[PDB]
Amino acid sequence: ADEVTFVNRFTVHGAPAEFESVFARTAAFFARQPGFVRHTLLRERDKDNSYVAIAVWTDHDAFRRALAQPGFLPHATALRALSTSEHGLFTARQTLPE
Amino acid sequence: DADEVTFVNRFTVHGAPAEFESVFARTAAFFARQPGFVRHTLLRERDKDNSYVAIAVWTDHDAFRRALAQPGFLPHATALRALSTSEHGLFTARQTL
Ligand SMILES: [Cl-]
Ligand SMILES: [Cl-]
To answer: Which of A20, A72, B13, B35 is the most buried (most CB within 10 A)?
Structure first.
């Protein structure tokens, strides 16, 4: 649609359990932001410490409003503490089924 | 294992993006006829014309491997290898809201 997809690759350095906890609470916060559509956390099969998150928002503006929230900052901080992140924003060009 | 698998593949496109997308649409269409195909998305990084991520979901690791092993995959792997460089990983979904 007009919808953007945030993809975030995490290299987790500490305990994966602790990382997934910190993540869940991050996910919870975004889940109640206007324009939120969905979120997936992925774990790489042949590693303990590789992860990928995927967040869909209705539009760019909805997403940037969610990031500029003062409520997001402690989640951001906790994640940085526990992981190296390489992230980016995408559009969907082809989807199937659909 | 028995777990749902999400294949994630990063592409840098060196040839025409238009021809890359078209080849991909056919490739997705081929995947769509394979047992255990759940879904497929092709993403493009915003304000980059050459950076793509393809996300393919399969009911398990074996259905995915068997898709890639089919003779009819060969022309689609060939077309993409001529157009792009790529790095992939095999994942399992942990959370979803
Ligand atoms: Cl483990
Ligand atoms: Cl690459």
So the answer is: B13
